[PDB]
Amino acid sequence: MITDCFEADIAIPSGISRPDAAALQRCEGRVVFLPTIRRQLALADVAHESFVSGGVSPDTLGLLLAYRRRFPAVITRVLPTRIVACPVDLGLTHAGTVNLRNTSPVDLCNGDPVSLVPPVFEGQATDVRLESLDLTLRFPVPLPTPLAREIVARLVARG
Amino acid sequence: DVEFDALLGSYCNTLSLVRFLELGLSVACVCTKFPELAYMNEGRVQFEV
């Protein structure tokens, strides 16, 4: 359960409005970019204000470039006091099976590898904002790899 | 020829258990226990003024 699971526990603060707290109950299958593998973290280290540099929050093509400096993890259950995510690299669960959620506009298949991409699509950049805390959660998009290479390819060619 | 070594004895220390009540500072508290807190999300306190 250290090797099988790994319960990295994102703590939830005290002051969150019940419309904002119940907005996190629809954050089940997500991707959270943990900077380290600490067993106790805060939302500020998860939210986009951790991602921002000095004065500069980068664009979507740069938003890839510190995902791979971090540790993607998937939310397992949203308790009222905490949010638990197992890191992908260490160990998945007891049985080793976690559930995601298609925030894609794209249907998946069995057996295909799934790459996660920043919210690049139109009508899609939906960041669950904490109004009670002034925090945004830029949830990436799980995509099929025959798309997720082309979508990077269109962005690199655009620059 | 005869020689030896020795221990001239061991010394331990005693932790001092400190009850918060023993402190004079408990005057500022009023110490009451939730048998259950962790469940609580947002509690309020309400009293007439």
Binding site: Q25, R26, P80 | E36, Y39, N41, R44, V45, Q46, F47
Partner: peptide, 30 residues
């Protein structure tokens, strides 16, 4: 002749949520 009123603590808890997953409506008070 002083009047004493008991302090009132208002808090709400959802203990069963820990036992099981729940998706309560935001407006309603569990």
């Amino acid at each position: 002749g002083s009047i004493l009123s008991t302090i009132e603590v208002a808090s709400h808890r959802r203990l069963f949520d820990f036992f099981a997953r729940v998706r309560s409506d935001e407006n309603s008070l569990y």
